[PDB]
Design an enzyme around this catalytic site. Structure first.
Site, PDB file in Angstrom:
ATOM      1  N   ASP A  12       0.749  -1.382   0.017  1.00  0.00           N
ATOM      2  CA  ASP A  12      -0.058   0.012  -0.081  1.00  0.00           C
ATOM      3  C   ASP A  12       0.841   1.460  -0.103  1.00  0.00           C
ATOM      4  O   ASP A  12       0.569   2.208   0.727  1.00  0.00           O
ATOM      5  CB  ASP A  12      -0.749   0.074   1.312  1.00  0.00           C
ATOM      6  CG  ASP A  12      -1.958  -1.306   1.010  1.00  0.00           C
ATOM      7  OD1 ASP A  12      -1.942  -1.929   0.052  1.00  0.00           O
ATOM      8  OD2 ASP A  12      -2.804  -1.388   2.062  1.00  0.00           O
ATOM      9  N   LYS A 110      -6.580  -5.494  -3.113  1.00  0.00           N
ATOM     10  CA  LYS A 110      -7.241  -5.732  -1.918  1.00  0.00           C
ATOM     11  C   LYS A 110      -8.314  -4.714  -1.197  1.00  0.00           C
ATOM     12  O   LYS A 110      -8.361  -3.867  -1.707  1.00  0.00           O
ATOM     13  CB  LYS A 110      -6.349  -6.283  -0.839  1.00  0.00           C
ATOM     14  CG  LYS A 110      -5.747  -5.172  -0.266  1.00  0.00           C
ATOM     15  CD  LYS A 110      -4.267  -5.908   0.844  1.00  0.00           C
ATOM     16  CE  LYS A 110      -3.501  -4.423   0.925  1.00  0.00           C
ATOM     17  NZ  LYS A 110      -4.200  -3.751   1.797  1.00  0.00           N
ATOM     18  N   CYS A 155      -1.689  -3.089   7.532  1.00  0.00           N
ATOM     19  CA  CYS A 155      -1.744  -4.135   6.424  1.00  0.00           C
ATOM     20  C   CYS A 155      -0.337  -4.370   6.502  1.00  0.00           C
ATOM     21  O   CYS A 155      -0.164  -5.595   5.893  1.00  0.00           O
ATOM     22  CB  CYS A 155      -1.994  -2.890   5.132  1.00  0.00           C
ATOM     23  SG  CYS A 155      -3.622  -2.212   5.123  1.00  0.00           S
TER      24      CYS A 155
END
Ligand SMILES: O=C(O)c1cccnc1
Ligand SMILES: O=C(O)c1cccnc1
Ligand SMILES: [Zn+2]
Ligand SMILES: [Zn+2]
Lengths: 208, 207
Positions: A12, A110, A155
């Site tokens: 991310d 995701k 994450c």
């Protein structure tokens, strides 16, 4: 250069989680040069992208009466609610313009199921829906995963902890991560990861 | 509205293979609107990207005295040589600006080993290096693959044929594909694909 059985998982590194974004983690842009350098140590590099529809269940905006950073109980357990972020196809979702890994071989999105979050690149928050990543890496002969990116305590931590569960040797490269620390999440994430056998390393351990 | 066990695989809808690109297939931009519309029928959508280093073995430019579109013999067998195309990080490698599939869940790059081509998004030209796609799809519970993109007779055909090899029900959506047709390659790719039980359908059959 790391052997063929190792992969770097870049978590991310998106406009949304860096300064200027809708869920900006302070200083999170400062890790990027280290990440760009690390990816040159690796034969195999995957990049992840939070990739939410506008109606995602993780946005406080989609739950009447609830505010960002509150937690709510869902079918699958506790869910922290967030500002809207990394919505599919928006500027907020793109990779940070400083990210520079032309050799990356996979981009796995995701969090795209409206009713299920997925901090982890490996498993969704229902603890049951597998994303495909484990299958992909195993097929490629990968047995070792190094995790970098944002956020350390969400994450990154959940990706690392799922990688362990799925049988990978897992390491987190601390200085190539940046955390949020909501209600003590950052130290707890480090403790859980360390209990589960995630190795905490620094970039200097690989680069030299 | 296709069920969860089916996926659309969108092959190399890139600047490089469309009018304007380094390996431009005529009219190939014209399939994009159909593709965008088709992606809306599927829960699960994967995009592929040809993703070559400048050094890549498939480029004529890296074999002095050879020409684009001629074939040479490599370790793994015959290799067509091409114009430079879809080099990592360049405009040529990027998705075509008209492609619009915000729900796409994966982008898999292929052809990134300097010494091995990979028309197929499932297996490389060496017939042995698996790309990860099979495992990813099986993990997700996907058993059916519909294939669209460019070129019908290369990356689309090989992707479809490898999908059959690997156990997927496989369809190719003909009008959402465009071919190059080198020395009869187009009609042959259709023959072989049908012999192997790839289903040839039209977008109207799905829409
Ligand atoms: O860790 C992340 O990238 C993250 C944090 C909050 C919400 N979604 C993703
Ligand atoms: O079919 C393709 O995408 C293709 C064709 C020629 C060379 N490389 C890829
Ligand atoms: Zn999120
Ligand atoms: Zn190619």
């Amino acid at each position: 250069k790391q052997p063929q059985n190792s992969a770097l998982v870049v978590v991310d590194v998106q406009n949304g989680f860096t300064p200027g974004g809708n869920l900006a983690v302070a200083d999170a842009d400062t890790i990027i040069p280290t990440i760009n350098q690390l990816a040159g140590c690796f034969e195999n590099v995957v990049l992840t992208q939070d990739w939410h529809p506008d109606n995602h269940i993780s946005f406080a905006a989609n739950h009447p009466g609830k505010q960002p950073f509150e937690t709510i109980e869902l079918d699958y357990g506790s869910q922290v609610l967030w500002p809207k972020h990394c919505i599919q196809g928006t500027h907020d979702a793109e990779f940070h313009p400083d990210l520079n890994i032309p050799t990356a071989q996979l981009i796995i999105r995701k969090g795209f199921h409206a009713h299920i979050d997925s901090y982890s690149a490996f498993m969704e928050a229902d603890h049951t829906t597998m994303t495909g990543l484990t299958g992909y890496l195993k097929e490629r002969g990968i047995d070792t995963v190094y995790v970098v990116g944002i956020a350390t305590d969400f994450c990154v931590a959940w990706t690392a902890l799922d990688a362990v569960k799925q049988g990978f040797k897992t390491l987190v490269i601390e200085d190539a991560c940046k955390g949020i620390d909501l209600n003590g999440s950052l130290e707890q994430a480090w403790q859980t990861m360390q209990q589960q056998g995630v190795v905490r390393i620094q970039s200097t351990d690989l680069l030299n």
